[PDB]
Design a protein around this nucleic acid. Sequence first.
DNA 1: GCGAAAGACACAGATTTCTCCTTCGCATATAGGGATGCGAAGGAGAAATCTGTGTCTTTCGCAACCCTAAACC
Length: 153
Amino acid sequence: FISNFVMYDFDKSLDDWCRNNGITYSRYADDITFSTNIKDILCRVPKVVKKMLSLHVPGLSINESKTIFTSMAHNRHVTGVTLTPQGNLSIGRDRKRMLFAKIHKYSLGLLSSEEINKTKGMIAFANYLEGDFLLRLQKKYGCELITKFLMEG
DNA sequence: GCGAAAGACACAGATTTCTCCTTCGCATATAGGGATGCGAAGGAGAAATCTGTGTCTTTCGCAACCCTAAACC
């Protein structure tokens, strides 16, 4: 809470500078992200943020070895959630096949009791992030098995 | 943010080795005498390599933590 209260002026000053140029800005703990649609406009902000940091909170500085540029032709994610080119949030294909294989192996009764509690939390998180994971699972394995798995333990 | 224990950075100074500077001695191509030129040892005084001192740098397994699942810092 103290850190959030401290970085108020920096947030306020950077917000109205980015708004006037059509750039979206957001900060999470000590991570800062910018995004836009205009070409060749994101190459000017590294000097601006440095001037703001020096002016509004003395002492802080930028780690210059963790700066990233990306577009629609490569992998895109924001703090652990993937953005498909269509414009929808996602968890990733590898995790989807992770869970589909785990549940299929569970249907044969070859899963330890620890992995049931392990997978239940991940399934709940994925359902919250997506909103339609449980429907797809029911449409593939049937409601009887899923309900039995859910009430297990 | 930074324990103990080894290096990097900057600044002196010291020393053995060597290379330039006398000094007179010689010599040999010209019938003895004199002269342009080169060789031999001291005697310097210059220079590259080495060595020594003082200020930082780095980042500990660093009395005093909870025990259900997932993601983030």
